[PDB]
Amino acid sequence: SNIELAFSSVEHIMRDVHNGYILRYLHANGASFFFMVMFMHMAKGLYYGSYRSPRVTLWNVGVIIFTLTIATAFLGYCCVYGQMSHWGATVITNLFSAIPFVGNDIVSWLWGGFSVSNPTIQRFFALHYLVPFIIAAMVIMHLMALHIHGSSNPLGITGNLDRIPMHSYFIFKDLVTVFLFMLILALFVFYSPNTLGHPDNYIPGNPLVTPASIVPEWYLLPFYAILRSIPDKLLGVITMFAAILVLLVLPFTDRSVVRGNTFKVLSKFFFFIFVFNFVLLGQIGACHVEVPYVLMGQIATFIYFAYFLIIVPVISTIENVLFYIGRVNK
Amino acid sequence: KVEVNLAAIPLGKNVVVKWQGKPVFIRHRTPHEIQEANSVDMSALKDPQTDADRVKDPQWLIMLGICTHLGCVPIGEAGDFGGWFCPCHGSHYDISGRIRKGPAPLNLEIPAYEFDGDKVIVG
Amino acid sequence: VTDQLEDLREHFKNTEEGKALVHHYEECAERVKIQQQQPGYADLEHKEDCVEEFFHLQHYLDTATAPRLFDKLK
Amino acid sequence: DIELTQTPVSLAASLGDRVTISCRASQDINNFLNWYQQKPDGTIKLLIYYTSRLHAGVPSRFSGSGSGTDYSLTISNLEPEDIATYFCQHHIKFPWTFGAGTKLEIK
Amino acid sequence: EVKLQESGAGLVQPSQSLSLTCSVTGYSITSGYYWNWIRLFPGNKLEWVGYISNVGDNNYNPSLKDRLSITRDTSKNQFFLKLNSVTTEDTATYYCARSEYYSVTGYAMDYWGQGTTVTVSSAWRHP
Amino acid sequence: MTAAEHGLHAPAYAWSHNGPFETFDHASIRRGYQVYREVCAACHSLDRVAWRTLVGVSHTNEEVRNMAEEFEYDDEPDEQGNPKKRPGKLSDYIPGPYPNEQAARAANQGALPPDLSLIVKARHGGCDYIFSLLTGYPDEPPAGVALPPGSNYNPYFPGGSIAMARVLFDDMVEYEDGTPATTSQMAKDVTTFLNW
Amino acid sequence: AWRTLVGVSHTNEEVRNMAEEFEYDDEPDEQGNPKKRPGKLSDYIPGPY
Numbered sequence A: 001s002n003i004e005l006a007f008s009s010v011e012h013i014m015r016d017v018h019n020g021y022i023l024r025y026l027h028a029n030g031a032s033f034f035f036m037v038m039f040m041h042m043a044k045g046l047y048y049g050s051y052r053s054p055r056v057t058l059w060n061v062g063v064i065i066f067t068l069t070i071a072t073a074f075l076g077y078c079c080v081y082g083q084m085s086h087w088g089a090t091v092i093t094n095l096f097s098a099i100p101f102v103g104n105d106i107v108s109w110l111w112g113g114f115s116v117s118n119p120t121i122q123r124f125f126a127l128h129y130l131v132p133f134i135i136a137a138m139v140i141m142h143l144m145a146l147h148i149h150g151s152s153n154p155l156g157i158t159g160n161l162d163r164i165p166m167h168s169y170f171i172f173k174d175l176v177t178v179f180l181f182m183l184i185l186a187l188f189v190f191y192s193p194n195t196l197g198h199p200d201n202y203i204p205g206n207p208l209v210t211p212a213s214i215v216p217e218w219y220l221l222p223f224y225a226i227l228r229s230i231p232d233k234l235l236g237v238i239t240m241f242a243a244i245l246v247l248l249v250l251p252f253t254d255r256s257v258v259r260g261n262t263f264k265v266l267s268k269f270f271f272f273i274f275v276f277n278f279v280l281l282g283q284i285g286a287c288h289v290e291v292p293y294v295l296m297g298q299i300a301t302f303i304y305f306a307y308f309l310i311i312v313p314v315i316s317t318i319e320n321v322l323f324y325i326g327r328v329n330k
Numbered sequence B: 001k002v003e004v005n006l007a008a009i010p011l012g013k014n015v016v017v018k019w020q021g022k023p024v025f026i027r028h029r030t031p032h033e034i035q036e037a038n039s040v041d042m043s044a045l046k047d048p049q050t051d052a053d054r055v056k057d058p059q060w061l062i063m064l065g066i067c068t069h070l071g072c073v074p075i076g077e078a079g080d081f082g083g084w085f086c087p088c089h090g091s092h093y094d095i096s097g098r099i100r101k102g103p104a105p106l107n108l109e110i111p112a113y114e115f116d117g118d119k120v121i122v123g
Numbered sequence C: 001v002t003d004q005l006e007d008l009r010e011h012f013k014n015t016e017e018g019k020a021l022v023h024h025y026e027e028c029a030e031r032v033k034i035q036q037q038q039p040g041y042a043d044l045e046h047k048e049d050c051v052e053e054f055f056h057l058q059h060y061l062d063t064a065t066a067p068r069l070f071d072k073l074k
Numbered sequence D: 001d002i003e004l005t006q007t008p009v010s011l012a013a014s015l016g017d018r019v020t021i022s023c024r025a026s027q028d029i030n031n032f033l034n035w036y037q038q039k040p041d042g043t044i045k046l047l048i049y050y051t052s053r054l055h056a057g058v059p060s061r062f063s064g065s066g067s068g069t070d071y072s073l074t075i076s077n078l079e080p081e082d083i084a085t086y087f088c089q090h091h092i093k094f095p096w097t098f099g100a101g102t103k104l105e106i107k
Numbered sequence E: 001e002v003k004l005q006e007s008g009a010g011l012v013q014p015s016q017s018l019s020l021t022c023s024v025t026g027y028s029i030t031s032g033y034y035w036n037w038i039r040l041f042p043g044n045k046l047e048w049v050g051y052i053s054n055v056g057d058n059n060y061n062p063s064l065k066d067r068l069s070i071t072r073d074t075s076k077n078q079f080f081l082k083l084n085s086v087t088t089e090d091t092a093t094y095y096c097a098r099s100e101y102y103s104v105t106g107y108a109m110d111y112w113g114q115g116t117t118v119t120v121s122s123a124w125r126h127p
Numbered sequence F: 001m002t003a004a005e006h007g008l009h010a011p012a013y014a015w016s017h018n019g020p021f022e023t024f025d026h027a028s029i030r031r032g033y034q035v036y037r038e039v040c041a042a043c044h045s046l047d048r049v050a051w052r053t054l055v056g057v058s059h060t061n062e063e064v065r066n067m068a069e070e071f072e073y074d075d076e077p078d079e080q081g082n083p084k085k086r087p088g089k090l091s092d093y094i095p096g097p098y099p100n101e102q103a104a105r106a107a108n109q110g111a112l113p114p115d116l117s118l119i120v121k122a123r124h125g126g127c128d129y130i131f132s133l134l135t136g137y138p139d140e141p142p143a144g145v146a147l148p149p150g151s152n153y154n155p156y157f158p159g160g161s162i163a164m165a166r167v168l169f170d171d172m173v174e175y176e177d178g179t180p181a182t183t184s185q186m187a188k189d190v191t192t193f194l195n196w
Numbered sequence G: 001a002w003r004t005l006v007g008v009s010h011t012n013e014e015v016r017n018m019a020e021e022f023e024y025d026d027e028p029d030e031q032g033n034p035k036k037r038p039g040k041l042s043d044y045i046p047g048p049y
C-alpha cells in the first residue's frame, strides 16, 4: 500500500503471481458487474413498488448498502495509484471542503497531510479492506427485513394464497442466471478485460499533472454529470448527494393505491423516461463541458429530481382517479 | 523552500515546480499578456482582484496550480480566457490566474515569495 | 524496397476521391500563404489553418490503406 | 524635488540607424524611470517602464538601460514612424518630474 | 480595452476656474489603480498635476496643490480637473492618464487621454 | 472540441493477434525487440520487463543470457564494504538509457520519453494508435500550423505537436531473419513487441 | 531524527547546527548529476559505516 510501491505491486500481481491477472481482472470487472446488477435490482424495486409499505425499512437499508458500495469501490480504485486513482482521491476527498468552516480541516485529516500522499493511500487500503465486511452485515439486516414480509411479485398484490418453497424451484432458477452471469463476466475477464476501465490508470499517479483525458468510472458518471451541471461548488456537491438521498422519498410521493407499474399506462411510460434520462446523464458525464452538453445535463438533472418529487405524485394521483371514474356509474 | 532560477525560463513559457507536494505555476509573461491582465474590470470577476494584488513583478506570475474547486491541476495555455483550463469540471482561469468561468469559487492562490536577483525563493 | 504504406497512400491519393480531397486541401493551402504575406498577420487573432482539410485527406487514406497494409507485411 | 536633463536636446538622424538619448537626474532614483512617446499628432504613448521593460505593442528595436542616475533609450532602425518627442519620468517619490524633451527629426 | 476621452472648455479667461472632464470606458475608476492629470507646456516641459485613486484619495503636485481639486463621479465613470484662478501660466494642453502600480516596478502611465488644449485668453467665445 | 485538439482517429489495422482464437505472432515479437534495442532504447526505458520473460517467447535461454550479460548492474559490496558491479542475469530487469528523470529531460529538450512497458494499454487505440503515430509523421505540417521550436507535427497525437521526431526510416535495421525492414514493417513489429 | 532532540535535550538552533555538520544526498540538479546537501531537522542521525 506504500505510495512508492502500490502501482508496481499491482503490476507484480499482473506479471509474477500465478493466475494473478485473472484475480485482478475478476476483481476490476466484477466491481463493474456488481454495479450493473445493483442498478437492475434497484430499477426492479422502482418499477414494482418494492419500496412501498410494508417494505420501507427493506428499501432504506438498501439505500445505505448502495452508498457503502460506492464508497468501497472508490477506495479500491485509489489503491491502484494510477493517474485516475490520484485525482479521483483528490477530487472526492475535496467534496468535504465544501462543508462550512470546518471543511478544509476534514480534508487534511482525511489526507493525513498536505495533499494525497503515502498516509492517504495506506489508510484507503485499510478502509477498503474493512467496508466490504460492513456491507456484509448490512446485507444480513437487508435479508432480515425481507424475511418478515417476504418478496413482492409482478402483480403487486398478495402472495399469500399461492406459495411454493425456495428449495428446488428458485434454487435451480437462480442457477440459470448465475451461469449466464458467469459466462458474460468470463467473456470480459478473458477476452476484453480493460474495456470497462480507463487507460490513464496504467500510468503511475503524478501529483503535478492532471490528464486532459480524466473521466470518472462509468458507474459514477450520472452522478458526476449532476454535480457538474451546477456552477457552484457547495450546491454542486449538495445536489449530487441529494440525487442519492431522494430515493428515500418514494414511499411518500407514490400516492397510488396499487403497488407497482404492471397495470399502469402512464407510470410505465414515465418510468422508462426516468431510465433513459439516467443513461443520458451518464453519456453527458462522459462528454466535455461544452455548449449543447451543459444545457442538456442541466435539463436531465431537473428531470431526474422532478420524477420523484413531481411526476410520480401527480401521475399516480391521476391514475387513481382514472381507475375510479372508469367503473363507477354515479 | 524551493529556489527557482528565473533566468532559465524563456519569454512566453510556463514552468511547473514542486513545493510541499503542491505544483507551483510560474509564467514569464509577455508585455501583451501583462496588459491583458491589468485591463479587466472587477465587475467581470466573481473573485475581484487586480493583477497587482496578485503579482509583485508584472513579468512573473507565481501561483499554486491547485484548482480551487476540487483540487485538480489546471492545464496551461488552454481555455477561453488565454490562461489555464481545469479538465476536471471545466474551470477557466485568465492570464492573471483569476477564475472567469466554472464552479471554482476563487482565483489561484498566491504563495509567499521573495526575489534574489536572477532567482525567486518560494515559501 | 519502397515502404508499403507510402506505396498504398500514393496509390490512393490518385483516385478520383483522393484527388478531390487533395484539391480541397490545396485550395486551403493557397488561401493561407496569401494571408501570411499581407500585413498584420503576426497580429490577427484569426489565423486560418488547414488541419481540417488535411484530416479529411488523411482520414480517407486511413480508411483505404488500413484494411490492406498488413496483407503486404510479414 | 528631482529634475531630469534630457540630452541630446532635439538631435536628428537618418532613415534607418541607431540613436542613443539619455536622462540624468539630480538625486539618485533606483531604476524607476519610464519613457514616453509624444507623436506629432499629440498622441502620447508609454514605451518603457523600470528602464528596460517594454510596454505592449512597442517594437523589439527599442532598448533601455542604465541605473542610479544615468539612463538610456536606444533604437535599431528609425523605419519610418519613430519621429516624435521622447520624454522620461521618475516615480521614486512625489512629485513625478519629466525630462526636458528630445525631438527626433529626419534629414 | 480601455479608453480615455477628454472634454471641457478649451478657453478660459484669467482669474477664472478651468474645468476638464476625463471620461473612461472599458474599465471602472473604482476598480483599479491611479487616475492622473498632467499638462504639456508649449516650451515642451511636461508637468504632473495630480491624481485621484480608486479609493478616492487625492495626491497633488505641491507646485499647484492649493488651487486644484480632482474629483470623480462613479456613476458616469469620469474624473475631473479644476484649476482655480488661472494665469497665462496655465496655458497648456492637458492630459488625463491611468497609472498602474506594481510593488517592484513602481508606477507607469499606460493609458492616455486624447489631449485637450486650453488657452488662458481674454477673448470672447460662444459657450 | 476541435479535431486538432482531439487528434486524428487511428484506423483499424488487421493485427494477427486480433480475434478471440489468435495468439501473438512470436516472430514479429522477436523482430520488434531488435527495433526496440537498436532504435527506441536510446530514449525509452522498459522498466517492468525482466530478461527471463523473453525466454521461450521470442528468444532462447542462451540468447537472453548473452543479452543480459552485456549490461552491468550493482552487486553486493565486497568483504571490505567497497561497492562493486556485476554482469546482468536473467532475474534482472531490462535497464533504461537514463539514470534519473532530470537526465532524461536534459537529453530531450526538456521532454520525458515515457516508459513503454505498458504504453499499449495506457493509450486509447492500443496497437492501432502506436503504429499510426510511428508511421504518421508528414514531411511538412498542414498550412497555417505554427509549430513550436523543437516540436514535431503528427496528426494522431492530441494537439498535433509532439516532442518525439520521426525515428523510423527504411532499412535502418538489418533484420536477423531476412525480412525487408521498411518503416511500416518495423512499426508493425515493435508495436507487436510492446503489446506483449 | 534530529528534530526529536529539540525541546528535549537541545534548542532548535543547536540541533540545526549539529545537523548541518553532516552531508546527505540531495535531489539531482537540472542536468541529472548527483549532488550533496547539509543536513536538516527532518533528517535522521547518520551512522559511521
Ligand code: HEM
Residues within 6 Å of the ligand: F035, F036, F039, F040, F041, F042, F043, F044, F108, F111, F112, F113, F114, F119, F123, F130, F133, F134, F161, F162, F163, F164, F165, F167, F168, F190
Ligand atoms: C522506437 C521505434 C520508438 C517507439 C516505439 C516510440 C514510441 C513512443 C510512444 C508510444 C510515445 C508516447 C506518445 C504519447 O504520449 O501518446 C513516445 C514519446 C516520446 N518519445 Fe518515443 N519512441 C521511439 C523512439 C524514440 C527515440 C529514439 C527517442 C529519443 C530521440 C524518442 C523520444 C520520445 C520523446 C521525447 C517522447 C515524448 C513525446 C511528448 O511528450 O511530446 N522516442 N515514444
Ligand code: HEM
Residues within 6 Å of the ligand: A038, A041, A042, A045, A048, A049, A050, A051, A055, A058, A059, A061, A062, A063, A065, A066, A139, A142, A146, A150, A151, A152, A153
Ligand atoms: C449488496 C447488495 C444487495 C444484496 C445482496 C441484496 C439482496 C436481496 C435479495 C436476496 C432480495 C430478494 C430477491 C430479489 O428480490 O432480488 C432482495 C430484495 C430487495 N432488495 Fe436488495 N440487495 C442488495 C441491495 C439493494 C439495494 C441497493 C436496494 C435498493 C436501494 C435494495 C432493495 C431491495 C428491495 C426493495 C427488495 C424487495 C423486492 C421485492 O420483493 O419486490 N436491495 N435484495
Ligand SMILES: C/C=C(C)/C=C/C=C/C(OC)[C@@H](C)[C@H](OC)[C@@H](C)CCc1oc2c(O)c(OC)cc(OC)c2c(=O)c1C
Residues within 6 Å of the ligand: A067, A068, A070, A071, A074, A084, A085, A087, A088, A091, A092, A093, A110, A127, A214, A215, A216, A217, A220, A223, A224, A227, A240, A241, B088, B089
Ligand atoms: C474514507 C472515504 C471517503 C473520504 C469517501 C467516500 C465517499 C464519497 C462518495 O460516495 C460515497 C463519492 C464516491 C461520490 O458519491 C457522491 C461519487 C458519486 C463520486 C462521483 C465523482 O467521481 C469522480 C471520479 O471517480 C473521478 O475519477 C477520475 C474524477 C472526478 O472528478 C473529475 C469525480 C467527480 O467529480 C465525482 C463527483
Ligand code: FES
Residues within 6 Å of the ligand: B067, B068, B069, B070, B071, B072, B086, B087, B088, B089, B090, B091, B102, B103, B104
Ligand atoms: S477541480 Fe477544477 S473544475 Fe473541479
